[PDB]
Amino acid sequence: LVFFAAXLKA
């Protein structure tokens, strides 16, 4: 999973 909310887990 790519996540951003201001920064991978995919």
> Which parts of this chain interact with its own copies (CB under 8 A)?
1-10
Q: How far is the CB of 2 from its own copies (least distance, A)?
A: 4
Give me the least distance between CB of 5 and its own copies, in Å please: 4
Q: Are 3 and 10 in contact (CB under 8 A)?
A: no
Pair 9, 1: CB distance under 8 Å = yes
Return d(Cα 2, Cα 10) in angstroms, integer: 6
Closest approach of its own copies to the CB of residue 6, in Å: 6
